Symmetry: D2
């Protein structure tokens, strides 16, 4: 495998930033089924509502969403497949939070971490 300090081939910054902002808004909506639907078909059945509700508990403590900040792009080659990652700053009333999201080439989530 490989860890990349930029996006892999086939990914582009603007598409990744735009999808990450939409996917964080879907996570903040508290709609578990819409958030689950943003993951690759093969990983959806690996997700739980309990784990999502634990994220919502921590999320509520941040206060109101204020703005999106800077993006840091990364990548990974795992089992000859490419994954594009982004560390995006989300500014809440109680402070800045760094989200880590990763996508497959079809732009569906493989990972989502607050």
């Amino acid at each position: 495998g490989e860890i990349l300090k930029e996006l892999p081939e086939g990914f582009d910054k603007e598409t990744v930033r735009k999808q990450a902002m939409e996917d964080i808004e879907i996570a903040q909506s508290k709609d578990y089924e819409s958030w689950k639907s943003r993951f690759t078909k093969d990983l959806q059945s690996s997700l739980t509502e309990e784990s999502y509700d634990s994220y919502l508990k921590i999320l509520e403590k941040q206060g109101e969403f204020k703005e999106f900040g800077k993006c840091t792009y990364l990548g990974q080659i795992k089992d000859n497949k490419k994954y594009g990652g982004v560390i995006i700053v989300v500014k809440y009333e109680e402070g800045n939070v760094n989200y880590s999201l990763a996508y497959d080439e079809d732009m569906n989530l493989v990972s989502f971490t607050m």
Copy 2:
């Protein structure tokens, strides 16, 4: 804050790689209290044995430890404090696993992810 694509000042690759290999060996030992003791004093009380046992469940499915592989170094500046990170390949009988570890300047864990 800042996301860095190398270690911050005050960290060095050899020290970080050596500590990451020791800390992954302590995690594989199944000794929860020794593993907990490797985290910064302020984060120890945030850890649970249940979360560590969930890691041990996933770890057991990998088979026997075979070797350490390549290291990828990263960093973060959060609330004017520096954190050194490493993505290290751990080769098990069932395949390669990428661990993500982060340290404070005193070389105690702030994050540990399989």
Copy 3:
């Protein structure tokens, strides 16, 4: 000193990209004095018209400017001062050329390489 795999603090990607494209256009204009004036005061005396004319000779062999491509951002800390760098793709009729430009915090050139 430090070589960084991102811009240092005080530099912004969008500002760097705009200045790099402007500065490469000034270099392509064949106006030596305007190009020289884009460098920090301390480095102006170090530049020669002969060296700039050698660049123009190599530049003419590329054909017509077609487009700017992708940017790769880097940085450097040298004698406690911060320098923001960019590797920018310049697409000419005869092919792609990677320019390396570096700036001081006042957004004046410290380095320019075709």
Copy 4:
């Protein structure tokens, strides 16, 4: 094409660091023909003794070689071929100098800059 913030596949850090230090020592030896011979066959005809002697003039002003410092690894994909790069610190009596060297997969120089 691609600019990478790590070595491409097929390159190893330790091999690159050893070759870069060897190649900088050959450059410092003032042996033009040995230095030229370290470049890929296609690029040898492009080198001049005059350009190498200009480097030797600047090199002599640095004083005695003291030590090699840190390495920063980069890469490039150009016309579907992979190139591994290193920015290596060379500490001279008069101060630190950052050399930029790039290699093809056969570990022959494609670029050498002081």
